[PDB]
Structures are given as structure tokens and as C-alpha cells.
């Protein structure tokens, strides 16, 4: 899926930048119409990571996951994606404290539907966080940022690293083991972030202090205004033992049931 | 008298029995929320309240800490959660646990019983099922429903005629006398259970046959792969005579020394 640079136009002003490179809004000429795109532009291991990121996204086909248009190799390496105009969820909620609880339920349920599909496809995200959810509209979220994602081997249900702690399940920190269950743990933190309107989890604590807090059986408190059933779901996501923690099928159905009971 | 509003119970049950049910829960503390295990009486109350009264007097790293009693749809005893659950159940499913690991755990139990003995409480139900794992390397004593505070003038509690007889020292069966020494006998059975990966003691024998076997001077054999020094400690805990049986001071000391090597 190597795109033609002649069919891509990048805007001058960037949408954002960080240690990953830059993100610009762009336009890609397709069959007949022109498609608005977001382009991750690299500013080496980062090339291979971007290609691995593109390989994951091309295997994924779901309304709640950012769709890749292709890779473009010209002047710099570029990952061209369908544009989610409103950008990252945590920034959006920081700037829009008026969003209602039923709206946040809608969004995090959409994230659980995308992750239910990711789990069925036997991919692990490994970076599930509110910053990696992007808003198409105020009522349409998509999971983004597959740069750490891994396709599980056909014979294993976890990825084993050889060598963002506040989002990581205890078995990740201790055993370097990443599964769909550890994504569920990260999903609990994402939920906490979303109902906290984009505030950071475990405020003012270092990683080792978070680890020690969880070891004692302590968990973050219920965000102000968060429906009790949603806080109960977070705590289930933060089940310490992998086997008793739910998978995304159970999480999505709990969210689906609660959302329609509100609706 | 805890506020039921501050407590959430998972619909799944961890376990059940004649006492009631045990459920995982989450309780709102000062700021953080605390994972709890909840013993729920099925609609016995005064026994639960007496159990709470024992636990409220105990503070030690190797004893389950009580959060409180909660009176709502049922009577509930809310406790700090030891997530891995009963030791006998765990070992059955984890035959890979090393003998060094089992030594660390039973030594932790002897440290909590040393404290129990110093506090002059008798447990009266010391068994592998009543050791709960916080982690694979951290055990806690639980289940104080039978525990008694000793009189200021005696080192034993006298019972008045539901007893785990396979864990009871001969003086418990014959004279109804429960002391820290009789907990030491139970601890010997616990050790045998731990090194047998949670097998039940005296397999296939009735209670009267266990008593007759013990009266004959016979004892359970060495568990497969159980270290020599640890089986020897078991037999010392199973000293028939109360006065010659060690106290938890001596048991803990020997465990710590063998663990040091
Ligand atoms: C926070 O996470 C991001 C995401 N990621 C980069 C990334 C974005 N991608 C994408 C795909 C499809 N549509 C979009 N739309 C979009 C729309 C407006 C945006 C941003 C993105 C945006 C940013 O991205 C800034 C943070 C870098 C800022 N604004 C301004 C409103 F705030 N982005 N894809 C990837 C891999 C790493 C960063 O940390
Ligand atoms: C066999 O022992 C028990 C213990 N007891 C009940 C009891 C538990 N309490 C407690 C306190 C703090 N943390 C725990 N943690 C914990 C964690 C996972 C557990 C259990 C308990 C658990 C059970 O309890 C089943 C047997 C009923 C099952 N699972 C699933 C893995 F097996 N339990 N407190 C009391 C008084 C009477 C029985 O004899």
C-alpha cells in the first residue's frame, strides 16, 4: 500500500508533534473525490516501527479503529490515515468539560467494540490510553496508535517482551507478558481517564509507587460524577490475576447493556 | 459498622459453604478504594460478631486484617483481600512450587502464630485451608471463627463438648483442652499438608481410626520430596505430651534457621 506522493498534499501548519515525529492534516486524491487525511511524518528503528505499525493497521478493518490509507516514501517516511478531525480524546475532554456522562459511556463503549474486534483478531494494542483514542465526532471514537501493537503467534495468547507504566497490568511490569487481558487493564485506566475528563492517572506518583499501591490491593478512586456501574467496571478491569480478569467480550457486553439502559 | 454504600460486591462468588459465601469486593477507604474479601452470612450472627471481635484485637503482617462488619441485606465480615486464596487449593494447582517456597510460607505462618501465642489467643482451626496467599511468597492466617482469648490464669481454653479432628492434638480430643501447644500440633498437620501440595491428611481414615493410630504412637509418613528437616519438625509438633511439645517460639526458630540455609 505504497502511495503516490504526487497525489498527497500536506497542509503547512502541523496538528501536533512529539518524540514520534509530526502529525499534519493533508488531502489524498483517490478514485474521483479527495479524502482528508492525517499524516504521521517521521523526523534507524523508527522507519521499521512505522512499517510494522502500517502492517498492523492494514490487517484491521473495523469502524472503531483508525483506517490506514497507506505508506508514502518520499522526502520523509509518512503514514497516511483517514482523518479523525477532533483529535485525541484526552485533550478534547480537557477542553470540553460539558460532555455528559451518557456521551462518555457511548465513547468508551465504542472503544470496547474496537477492542473486542482487536481481541478476536488476536492483536494486542499495548498502548491503550485516552491519548490514543481519536474523535471523529463528539459521538464517534476510534482507537489509534498501533506502533506498539503485536500480532499474537498462532500458538500463544501473549506477547513476551525481552526487556507507560501507569497503564500497564502487573503481569506486564513483572513478567513482560502482554495479552488482550493486559489491554483490558489499560482499558480500565482509559475509562478512568475519560470519566475524569482527560486528567492523568495516579497523579503525582512514580511508577514504583503505582506498582506498590496496586500490590497492596488499592485502586484509584471513583471520578467525580462517574456512574457507579462504570466505576465498578473499571475495578473489574483492574483484577490483579490475569485469569479472573474479564476479556473484551465481557467488557463490551457490560458496556453495551449499561449504555442501552441509560438510552 | 461499615456503610453498605461504600462497598461493591462482585456477582461471582469466590467460594461457599455452611458458613455462607465469600465474595470479592471493593470498599471505599479514606481516598483509595481497597480490594476486600467479604464473608457473607446467608439469612451464626453472634459467631460472626465474635470472629470480628477477635480480628479487631490482632495486628500482624501474617494475619488477615479485618476492615469491619457490615449489616445490610446480609451480615458481612469485610477483610483485606488475600488474592490467591487458600493455601491447600493453590498448591494443588501449582505442583511446581519449590520446597524452598513452601518453607518460606510455613515459616510465615509460624511467625503469625508466634504472635498469636504471645497475644495469648488460641486459633483452634489451624489448617492449610485457613492459610491465605497474598502472593506466592506471602501467606496470612485467616478464619478466627473458633479462636478464643485465654484467661489471665490459664494457658488453655476448656471446650464444652463441628471439630476438624484430623488437625486436633490428643488433649483436644480427650480433655477438650485448647492451648497454643495444641495449635502447634495443628501446625504440624498444616506443614504436612503444605509439603503434600494440599492433599488431605490421613487419607481414607475415619476420625476414630486417626485417634487410635495416634494413640499407638504412629504418625503420617514423609511427603514425597519433602525435606528431611521439615518432616522432623512435623514429628516434633506431633509430640503426644503437651508439656514436651514445642511452642511456636521454638518452631519459628527452627524454620527460620533451616530457611536461612
Ligand atoms: C495523543 O495521541 C497522538 C496520536 N499519535 C499520533 C497520531 C495521530 N494520528 C491520527 C490519525 C487519524 N486522525 C488523526 N486526527 C487528529 C486531529 C487533530 C489533532 C491530532 C490528530 C493531534 C495529534 O495527533 C497530536 C498529539 C500529536 C492534534 N490534533 C489537534 C487537536 F488536538 N490523528 N495517528 C497517529 C499515530 C501520537 C500522539 O500522542
Ligand atoms: C478454604 O478456606 C476458606 C476460608 N474461609 C472463608 C474465609 C475467606 N476469607 C478471606 C479473607 C481474606 N482474603 C480472602 N481471599 C480469597 C481469595 C480467593 C479465594 C478465597 C478467598 C476462597 C474461599 O474462601 C472459598 C473456600 C470458601 C476461594 N477463593 C478462590 C480461590 F480458591 N479470603 N476469610 C474467611 C473467613 C472458610 C474456608 O475454610
UniProtKB/Swiss-Prot annotation, chain B:
Q: Which UniProt keywords apply?
A: Adaptive immunity, Angiogenesis, ATP-binding, Cell membrane, Cytoplasm, Disease variant, Host-virus interaction, Immunity, Innate immunity, Kinase, Membrane, Nucleotide-binding, Phosphoprotein, Repeat, SH2 domain, Transferase, Tyrosine-protein kinase, Ubl conjugation
| Section covered of the full-length record | 364 to 632 of 635
Q: What is this protein called?
A: Tyrosine-protein kinase SYK
Q: Name one GO cellular component term.
A: B cell receptor complex
Query: Ubl conjugation among the record's keywords?
Result: yes
Please state what the annotation says regarding this protein's domains. Answer: The SH2 domains mediate the interaction of SYK with the phosphorylated ITAM domains of transmembrane proteins. Some proteins like CLEC1B have a partial ITAM domain (also called hemITAM) containing a single YxxL motif. The interaction with SYK requires CLEC1B homodimerization.
The entry's note on the tissues where this protein occurs is: Widely expressed in hematopoietic cells (at protein level). Expressed in neutrophils (at protein level). Within the B-cell compartment, expressed from pro- and pre-B cells to plasma cells.
Q: Which residues form the Protein kinase domain?
A: 8-260
Gene Ontology BP, a term: interleukin-3-mediated signaling pathway
What the entry says about post-translational processing?
Ubiquitinated by CBLB after BCR activation; which promotes proteasomal degradation.
Q: Does the keyword Ubl conjugation apply?
A: yes
Q: Which family does it belong to?
A: Belongs to the protein kinase superfamily. Tyr protein kinase family. SYK/ZAP-70 subfamily.
Amino acid at each position: 500500500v505504497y502511495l503516490d506522493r504526487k497525489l498527497l498534499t500536506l497542509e503547512d501548519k502541523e496538528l501536533g508533534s512529539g518524540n514520534f515525529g509530526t502529525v499534519k492534516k493533508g488531502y489524498y486524491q483517490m478514485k474521483k473525490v479527495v479524502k482528508t487525511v492525517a499524516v504521521k511524518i517521521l523526523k534507524p528503528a523508527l522507519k521499521d516501527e512505522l512499517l510494522a505499525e502500517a502492517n498492523v493497521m492494514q490487517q484491521l478493518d473495523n469502524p472503531y479503529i483508525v483506517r490506514m490509507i497507506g505508506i508514502c516514501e518520499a522526502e520523509s517516511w509518512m503514514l497516511v490515515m483517514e482523518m479523525a478531525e477532533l483529535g485525541p480524546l484526552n485533550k478534547y475532554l480537557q477542553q470540553n468539560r460539558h460532555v455528559k456522562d451518557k456521551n462518555i459511556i457511548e465513547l468508551v463503549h465504542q472503544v470496547s467494540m474496537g477492542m473486542k474486534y482487536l481481541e478476536e483478531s488476536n492483536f494486542v494494542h499495548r498502548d491503550l490510553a485516552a491519548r490514543n483514542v481519536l474523535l471523529v465526532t463528539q459521538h464517534y471514537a476510534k482507537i489509534s496508535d498501533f506502533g506498539l501493537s503485536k500480532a499474537l503467534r498462532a500458538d500463544e495468547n501473549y506477547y513476551k517482551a525481552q526487556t507507560p507504566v501507569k497503564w500497564y497490568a502487573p503481569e506486564c511490569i513483572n513478567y513482560y507478558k502482554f495479552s488482550s487481558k493486559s489491554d483490558v487493564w489499560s482499558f480500565g485506566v482509559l475509562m478512568w481517564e475519560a470519566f475524569s475528563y482527560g486528567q492523568k492517572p495516579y497523579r503525582g506518583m512514580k511508577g514504583s509507587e503505582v506498582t506498590a499501591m496496586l500490590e497492596k490491593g488499592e485502586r484509584m478512586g471513583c471520578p467525580a460524577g462517574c456512574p457507579r456501574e462504570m466505576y465498578d467496571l473499571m475495578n473489574l478491569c483492574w483484577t490483579y490475576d490475569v485469569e479472573n480478569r474479564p476479556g473484551f467480550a465481557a467488557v463490551e457486553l457490560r458496556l453495551r447493556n449499561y449504555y442501552y439502559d441509560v438510552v
